[PDB]
Amino acid sequence: NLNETGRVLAVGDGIARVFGLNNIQAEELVEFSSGVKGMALNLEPGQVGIVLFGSDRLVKEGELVKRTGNIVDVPVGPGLLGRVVDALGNPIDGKGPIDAAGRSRAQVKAPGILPRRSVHEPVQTGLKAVDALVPIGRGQRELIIGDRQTGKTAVALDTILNQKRWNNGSDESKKLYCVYVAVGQKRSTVAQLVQTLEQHDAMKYSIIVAATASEAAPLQYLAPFTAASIGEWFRDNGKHALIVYDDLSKQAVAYRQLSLLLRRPPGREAYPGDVFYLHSRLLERAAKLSEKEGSGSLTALPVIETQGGDVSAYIPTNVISITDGQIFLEAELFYKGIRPAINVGLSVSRVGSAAQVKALKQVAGSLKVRGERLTQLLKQNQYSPLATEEQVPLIYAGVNGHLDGIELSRIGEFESSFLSYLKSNHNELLTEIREKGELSKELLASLKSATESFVATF
Amino acid sequence: NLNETGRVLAVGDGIARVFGLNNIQAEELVEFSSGVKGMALNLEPGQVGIVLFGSDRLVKEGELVKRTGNIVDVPVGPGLLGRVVDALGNPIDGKGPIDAAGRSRAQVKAPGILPRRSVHEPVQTGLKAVDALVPIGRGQRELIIGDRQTGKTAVALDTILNQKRWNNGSDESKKLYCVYVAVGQKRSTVAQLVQTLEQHDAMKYSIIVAATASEAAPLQYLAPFTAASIGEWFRDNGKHALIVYDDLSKQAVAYRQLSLLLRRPPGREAYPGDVFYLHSRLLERAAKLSEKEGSGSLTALPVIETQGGDVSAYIPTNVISITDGQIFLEAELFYKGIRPAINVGLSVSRVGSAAQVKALKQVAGSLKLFLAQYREVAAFAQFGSDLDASTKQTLVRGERLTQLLKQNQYSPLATEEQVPLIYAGVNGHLDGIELSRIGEFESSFLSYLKSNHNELLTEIREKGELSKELLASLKSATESFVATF
Amino acid sequence: QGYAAEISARRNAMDNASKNAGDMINRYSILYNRTRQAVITNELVDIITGAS
Amino acid sequence: PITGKVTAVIGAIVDVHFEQSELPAILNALEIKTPQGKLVLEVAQHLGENTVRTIAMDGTEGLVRGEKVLDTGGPISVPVGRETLGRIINVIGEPIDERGPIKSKLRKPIHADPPSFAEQSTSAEILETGIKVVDLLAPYARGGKIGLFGGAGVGKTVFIQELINNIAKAHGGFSVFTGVGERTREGNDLYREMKETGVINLEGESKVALVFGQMNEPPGARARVALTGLTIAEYFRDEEGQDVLLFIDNIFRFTQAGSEVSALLGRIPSAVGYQPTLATDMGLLQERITTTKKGSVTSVQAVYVPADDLTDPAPATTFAHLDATTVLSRGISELGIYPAVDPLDSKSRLLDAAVVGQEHYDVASKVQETLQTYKSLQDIIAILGMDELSEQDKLTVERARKIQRFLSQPFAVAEVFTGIPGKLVRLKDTVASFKAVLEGKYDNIPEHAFYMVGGIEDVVAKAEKLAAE
């Protein structure tokens, strides 16, 4: 029965040429006898071309291929929370099976113009510099771009860790579930990231999709689209999701591999012409929806590695064109001890103040010897996220001038000694700045009474 | 009979496609009816790709091709001494046939880890700039690199000419037989090179393997490997051989042509993928063997022509990575009258310092440092009196040293004549002599020691190392000369 | 005193100048390598498309 | 066994036809019973018409069309175990030391599948080497990748031999060396040096297994030697439960051999000229070097950098995996501080307060700051003289120079050349000693008492020996 079955004519370079499968759909998933899965990428008369989601050793000429009857799809639902899953949705943590709420295609279009809404509610990263100068909104695409060993992963991991104070609260609309797509990363780094999230309890609300460097290039290619289809469930059912891609440069490399092995002519930087389409249909899915759809949102934080610190490269420029901003982490600052190494100059969030908390826009007065202590204050330890009721005073004391009189090496100790005192004595103001979110001028004066006192007491 | 014979289907540029020849071996030599012969580099399911050692004009569609049953091989032995041979071992010097002591394939495996031995014997070039600062050991691979007309052929040829001090002796262990692989060179240049060799009587211990620019690309590809197979006879019979490839860049070009006409997929710089496996397979057949194998050796001096002196190029990078050192000849020093134009800063021997002659090592150890300091101060020199005395001394020494290391071509000097001069220099005895007269000094000094202190030269070369007492006698003779010079 | 001062200010000035030259070299050493990679890639794209 | 026939020979690529319609799987090993030793071919593609395209591990000269070929029924299998110790193996697993067969009872395939996500180590940890500079300022990761930089004169081979000895004494773990695409003369130098040092002992218990591909071998061989050494290391891991070092020299040659094989197989070259499969080919190797509940394989990799460009695709993909770097410099050797590790250009991701601890991190940071400031004033120190400094800067320089020569260490392997007794220095002792130096508790001891002593307890005795002198 050649209609639903086929036989391999050839196999090589991760691509398999199969006879039959007459009734096969384009982009359909197929199962070889060896259990290895494939995708029907190109259909020709009398032969079908199938990309292999696995090592080509598993396929031999003459072997039977069967239709699974379904486009490339991934399981979706809340049962995935706390799990690690491969690009195709098979569990790899060994904790057991996935209690899927349904299945959703990998390649699905982004929502159009009408369903969307303006991004107006913040993604609180816990990092002074981002929350204060380059805010990230729910529904935005914000690129973290940098060189190797520059803090890229730590920013997104802190954004994930900080949400626990809301994901625990009963208010369903403030919660932000997290997805982390490790493309090209070593299984060891991913296992350590998972243990870090678990020991900070951040795993209750995080999903990890891992297509490691030992994974065949098709799976690295596919993982982001399935991670997006997982976030799109929270989006489409009224819930808020955040997706970190670490990193798209290696997805691009994998797509270059898959293409060049299919004899697809190389373009610039040997990349195929459709790399822009590889990323655009991935990142456009990050959208903030209207109350007609249910007010969901998917926030995309793609990561890019820049060779030699050059942002003029092809893939970086493409993702800068797609995205709504960039956080450029510069190695010169990292070595100098400025961590996180936010280049506030090249960094920009083109939605900007709309998402920022009213408190911080009121306080900061567009922060973009005094400036040196301000920089020292923006420095932040890893895995040490701060709340907005804590960030507001820190920016307050530096913008209004209080900190200029304190020794430079001692600023890091003011931060610790001030917020403790403000907590030990003045929690009322913190509660107001937290609950109301916008400072009344009388609370502006209360904060002045607090700072002009503590600076003197330090 | 389509096993032993075949028919040509197509003839392109230096390439032919043949039906039949089922039983043919890869890399086998075949003869066309017209007498032209070629080698079967591509075996396909129903045709054979044969590269021709001659003009396409001699092959036509429908022509019969007959196999020899012989993989491409070259004659070997001592009968080749004094001959000029093509890449396949046919004599072109016009003299009679070669009394080969056997035959050996071109592509043959280099000797492995176990049978080799540390390079411990000197290849005396007779060029002061080399024996003293970048020494070559018997078993080494040493790249002569530099732009056109910078002295490469001259370095190699002076090394060849010098060995007549030994190849006429009876000690078979010190002789060094020589092979010159002229690849892509003009035929007239090879003719006058042969003449230069015959004038100095060097030919009787030299072999010239010539694949000139007008000869087909396959022969330029093959010639280095057949010269290697010739030297390997000496290596394997307990004898010592030196092979000078002039030059391998043109071999890489020949291989590129050969492969692109065969339509093999190219890589960087239009070169095929495995050019590294061409030059390594050629070079690291050079080796010094263990006693279990007769303790022979084969020494390789490959030449690479670098355009604009850039070593970033693909083939130069590969050869620099394959070899045990490099001798860098710079045009900037050549047209300033320095000859040989050896850049002491970029040149390096990672092996030969163990092989160097002790008499020379003792005296020249500090020449590296003095020259490295001169190479810095040279920029400040033109200013004048403003310079400190601790730098004026450097500027005084390094000038005499650079004028010492230069020498005229076809004049290679014995170690017994080299060590006294490096001694006079490093010990600053030449400082009292005008820089314009150093050549008069050297030529005079040799005559004095030879005429009034011969016992010391005799001892230097009989022992190879300077006793406590010989250094003193050399100081005495050097000073007594410089004073009365 | 003016002669001494101008010599000292001609020794510090050229120091700053040489260090700025070093920084410019360290930038052009990245620009060069990028152009090298681009040139090789494109020469080989041309060769491959000719060979296809 | 299942028999086939050759149909094409194009360089290192050979096509074999299998009429029986029982074809060999990809990456399987076919072998042809040629004179002068049998030749192994590795299946790279299935082209159709029962034809398989393969890459040859040895020169294809002399092959006729119609030559018989046998399927070995699996990938290239190599011997494993104690028997491989003190022996030289080629990619296809044969002895090239000419001391006879490797009579191992087991043979394992080199194309193993790396451990699952569920089997990785959940947290990083340090492989204490016994070398002060590494263990303090750039510690090596257990199961990690370590890149060793530097050429001649910088003592690379002695560093490797000392790592082998220290691991074999402290951790009981054997070692494997793979020479990937390097010079044959240097491998013979390494073999004789190892025989003299004592890491190879033909009449006793050897510590290191040698796998030697080299430039003379076709690109298809160079592309696979590393997997053979990796399989020996993995066998020492999973069966014997050891922590096993895997030296690779050089990795760029693995990448280059992959590019050559890709070019020959017809694949379209990518960026500056490497194979499109670069990242995945590097990963399949590197991600097998990892820690598991049975043990750990830790890799020390020589990393050549083309055109000094740390951004050439090969360096970039290699560095993406490396967990540590160790730079051996001619400049530090000119100062006489063997083993010449630059304490400032070397780095490690595992030098974080979470992994090593604050007791360690504070000492390491303070030491690097001391040396960085000393270097930052290492010119005016000569112009104005050490007396013209501030007294605090003067004290920092006195600490810096003392530390700089305290990072020196005598190696037990080099005893047969240097004549000095060699020592281990444990991690506790190193950290405590450098803390004691940072606190100034041994300021009053002259600099030379820190040169090649070991720990501070020996700085004491050497100060007493100078006092006697």
Ligand SMILES: Nc1ncnc2c1ncn2[C@@H]1O[C@H](COP(=O)(O)OP(=O)(O)OP(=O)(O)O)[C@@H](O)[C@H]1O
């Ligand atoms: N905000 C921070 N403050 C201080 N140190 C940090 C901070 N963020 C990260 N680090 C440290 O710097 C290192 C940076 O690693 P990071 O998480 O940035 O990897 P990456 O840059 O995302 O990925 P790769 O390094 O592979 O390109 C880590 O070892 C971490 O301990």
Ligand SMILES: Nc1ncnc2c1ncn2[C@@H]1O[C@H](COP(=O)(O)OP(=O)(O)OP(=O)(O)O)[C@@H](O)[C@H]1O
């Ligand atoms: N040591 C020397 N002293 C004087 N002249 C020299 C010396 N060495 C080389 N020359 C001269 O420089 C020229 C060098 O040609 P040579 O035989 O070295 O070929 P080459 O430098 O390899 O040039 P090409 O690349 O064209 O072969 C000759 O004219 C020769 O006379």
Ligand SMILES: [Mg+2]
């Ligand atoms: Mg990262």
Ligand SMILES: [Mg+2]
């Ligand atoms: Mg010449």
